[PDB]
Design a protein around this motif. Sequence first.
Motif, PDB file in Angstrom:
ATOM      1  N   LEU A   2       0.826  -1.205   0.000  1.00 55.39           N
ATOM      2  CA  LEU A   2       0.000   0.000   0.000  1.00 55.39           C
ATOM      3  C   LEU A   2       0.861   1.257   0.000  1.00 55.39           C
ATOM      4  CD1 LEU A   2      -2.731   1.440   0.182  1.00 55.39           C
ATOM      5  CD2 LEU A   2      -2.638   1.138   2.665  1.00 55.39           C
ATOM      6  N   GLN A   3       1.943   1.255   0.784  1.00 55.38           N
ATOM      7  CA  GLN A   3       2.882   2.371   0.781  1.00 55.38           C
ATOM      8  C   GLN A   3       3.596   2.485  -0.561  1.00 55.38           C
ATOM      9  OE1 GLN A   3       3.890   4.544   3.927  1.00 55.38           O
ATOM     10  NE2 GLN A   3       4.015   5.614   1.957  1.00 55.38           N
ATOM     11  N   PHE A   4       3.875   1.346  -1.204  1.00 59.76           N
ATOM     12  CA  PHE A   4       4.479   1.352  -2.535  1.00 59.76           C
ATOM     13  C   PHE A   4       3.550   1.978  -3.572  1.00 59.76           C
ATOM     14  CE2 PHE A   4       4.338  -1.166  -6.524  1.00 59.76           C
ATOM     15  CZ  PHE A   4       5.479  -0.670  -7.131  1.00 59.76           C
ATOM     16  N   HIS A   5       2.264   1.607  -3.547  1.00 61.68           N
ATOM     17  CA  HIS A   5       1.296   2.204  -4.468  1.00 61.68           C
ATOM     18  C   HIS A   5       1.079   3.688  -4.186  1.00 61.68           C
ATOM     19  CE1 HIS A   5       0.054  -1.294  -6.806  1.00 61.68           C
ATOM     20  NE2 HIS A   5       0.001  -2.002  -5.692  1.00 61.68           N
ATOM     21  N   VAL A   6       1.050   4.083  -2.907  1.00 59.04           N
ATOM     22  CA  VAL A   6       0.906   5.496  -2.552  1.00 59.04           C
ATOM     23  C   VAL A   6       2.114   6.302  -3.027  1.00 59.04           C
ATOM     24  CG1 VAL A   6       0.951   7.057  -0.553  1.00 59.04           C
ATOM     25  CG2 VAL A   6      -0.746   5.244  -0.675  1.00 59.04           C
ATOM     26  N   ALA A   7       3.325   5.775  -2.810  1.00 57.56           N
ATOM     27  CA  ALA A   7       4.542   6.467  -3.222  1.00 57.56           C
ATOM     28  C   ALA A   7       4.646   6.578  -4.738  1.00 57.56           C
ATOM     29  CB  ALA A   7       5.769   5.753  -2.653  1.00 57.56           C
ATOM     30  N   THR A   8       4.309   5.506  -5.463  1.00 56.34           N
ATOM     31  CA  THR A   8       4.336   5.568  -6.919  1.00 56.34           C
ATOM     32  C   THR A   8       3.215   6.432  -7.485  1.00 56.34           C
ATOM     33  OG1 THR A   8       3.195   3.440  -6.891  1.00 56.34           O
ATOM     34  CG2 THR A   8       5.566   3.428  -7.268  1.00 56.34           C
ATOM     35  N   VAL A  10       2.506   9.202  -5.858  1.00 52.74           N
ATOM     36  CA  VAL A  10       3.101  10.511  -5.604  1.00 52.74           C
ATOM     37  C   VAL A  10       4.348  10.716  -6.459  1.00 52.74           C
ATOM     38  CG1 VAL A  10       4.179  11.981  -3.874  1.00 52.74           C
ATOM     39  CG2 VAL A  10       2.136  10.661  -3.284  1.00 52.74           C
ATOM     40  N   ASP A  11       5.360   9.868  -6.272  1.00 51.44           N
ATOM     41  CA  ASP A  11       6.666  10.070  -6.895  1.00 51.44           C
ATOM     42  C   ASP A  11       7.209   8.738  -7.383  1.00 51.44           C
ATOM     43  OD1 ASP A  11       8.927  11.292  -7.839  1.00 51.44           O
ATOM     44  OD2 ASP A  11       9.614  12.046  -5.898  1.00 51.44           O
ATOM     45  N   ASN A  12       7.324   8.590  -8.701  1.00 47.96           N
ATOM     46  CA  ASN A  12       7.901   7.398  -9.301  1.00 47.96           C
ATOM     47  C   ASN A  12       9.370   7.570  -9.668  1.00 47.96           C
ATOM     48  OD1 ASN A  12       7.344   4.710  -9.855  1.00 47.96           O
ATOM     49  ND2 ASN A  12       6.877   5.086 -12.017  1.00 47.96           N
ATOM     50  N   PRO A  18      11.529   0.803  -5.881  1.00 47.47           N
ATOM     51  CA  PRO A  18      11.230   0.020  -7.093  1.00 47.47           C
ATOM     52  C   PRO A  18      10.255   0.737  -8.017  1.00 47.47           C
ATOM     53  CG  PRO A  18      10.129  -0.916  -5.178  1.00 47.47           C
ATOM     54  CD  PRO A  18      11.092   0.108  -4.657  1.00 47.47           C
ATOM     55  N   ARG A  19      10.619   0.799  -9.296  1.00 45.55           N
ATOM     56  CA  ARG A  19       9.850   1.551 -10.278  1.00 45.55           C
ATOM     57  C   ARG A  19       8.511   0.879 -10.560  1.00 45.55           C
ATOM     58  NH1 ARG A  19      12.939   4.563  -8.720  1.00 45.55           N
ATOM     59  NH2 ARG A  19      14.564   5.719  -9.843  1.00 45.55           N
ATOM     60  N   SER A  24       2.712  -1.073 -20.856  1.00 46.16           N
ATOM     61  CA  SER A  24       3.392  -0.910 -22.136  1.00 46.16           C
ATOM     62  C   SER A  24       4.910  -0.833 -21.997  1.00 46.16           C
ATOM     63  CB  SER A  24       2.864   0.332 -22.855  1.00 46.16           C
ATOM     64  OG  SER A  24       3.247   1.514 -22.177  1.00 46.16           O
ATOM     65  N   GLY A  25       5.467  -1.387 -20.922  1.00 50.80           N
ATOM     66  CA  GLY A  25       6.909  -1.398 -20.766  1.00 50.80           C
ATOM     67  C   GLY A  25       7.528  -0.070 -20.395  1.00 50.80           C
ATOM     68  N   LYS A  26       6.764   0.824 -19.782  1.00 52.22           N
ATOM     69  CA  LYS A  26       7.202   2.157 -19.409  1.00 52.22           C
ATOM     70  C   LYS A  26       7.066   2.347 -17.903  1.00 52.22           C
ATOM     71  CE  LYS A  26       6.129   4.444 -23.755  1.00 52.22           C
ATOM     72  NZ  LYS A  26       5.611   3.389 -24.669  1.00 52.22           N
ATOM     73  N   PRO A  27       7.781   3.305 -17.319  1.00 50.01           N
ATOM     74  CA  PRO A  27       7.467   3.709 -15.945  1.00 50.01           C
ATOM     75  C   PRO A  27       6.166   4.496 -15.886  1.00 50.01           C
ATOM     76  CG  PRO A  27       9.262   5.028 -16.827  1.00 50.01           C
ATOM     77  CD  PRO A  27       9.048   3.898 -17.785  1.00 50.01           C
ATOM     78  N   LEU A  28       5.538   4.457 -14.711  1.00 52.70           N
ATOM     79  CA  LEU A  28       4.330   5.236 -14.473  1.00 52.70           C
ATOM     80  C   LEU A  28       4.648   6.725 -14.436  1.00 52.70           C
ATOM     81  CD1 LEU A  28       1.302   4.343 -13.826  1.00 52.70           C
ATOM     82  CD2 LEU A  28       2.944   2.475 -13.801  1.00 52.70           C
ATOM     83  N   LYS A  29       3.773   7.521 -15.044  1.00 63.23           N
ATOM     84  CA  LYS A  29       3.916   8.976 -15.048  1.00 63.23           C
ATOM     85  C   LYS A  29       3.131   9.528 -13.865  1.00 63.23           C
ATOM     86  CE  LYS A  29       3.299  13.098 -17.912  1.00 63.23           C
ATOM     87  NZ  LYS A  29       2.794  13.634 -19.206  1.00 63.23           N
ATOM     88  N   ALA A  30       3.849   9.940 -12.823  1.00 65.70           N
ATOM     89  CA  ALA A  30       3.220  10.442 -11.612  1.00 65.70           C
ATOM     90  C   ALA A  30       2.869  11.921 -11.765  1.00 65.70           C
ATOM     91  CB  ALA A  30       4.133  10.215 -10.409  1.00 65.70           C
TER      92      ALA A  30
END
Length: 49
Positions: A2-8, A10-12, A18-19, A24-30
């Motif tokens: 849950l903290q991982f999803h909240v942080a990603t 906020v800030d990826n 962990p990214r 689609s093979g990309k990082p999430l755009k926060a």
Amino acid sequence: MLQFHVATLVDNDMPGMPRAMQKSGKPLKAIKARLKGKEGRIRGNLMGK
DNA sequence: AAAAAAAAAAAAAAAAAAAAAAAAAAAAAAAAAAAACACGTGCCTGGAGACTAGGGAGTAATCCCCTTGGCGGTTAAAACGC
């Protein structure tokens, strides 16, 4: 996790963190990626609309 | 003719260089509290001064006993050799 999803949500771009994996093979755009940057919401949409 | 097991189709899910600022570890000198041979102080018991008088040591004379010195006769002790 849950903290991982909240942080990603906020800030990826945090190093040593962990990214978030998109479908689609990309990082999430926060929200930080939406604001910070030349093409961001500040520089590319408010500064330079 | 009805019930059970295996095969295949459909659906859900996890998988680049550079520079300023801050945190941190090794070090390092500066400064503030508990011990400790000898110094500070007061007391007293022992050290010091004086008189007496005596008994133990020095000095004088003697001697005789003990100590030193020589000469000779085997001779056991020492020396030399194999």
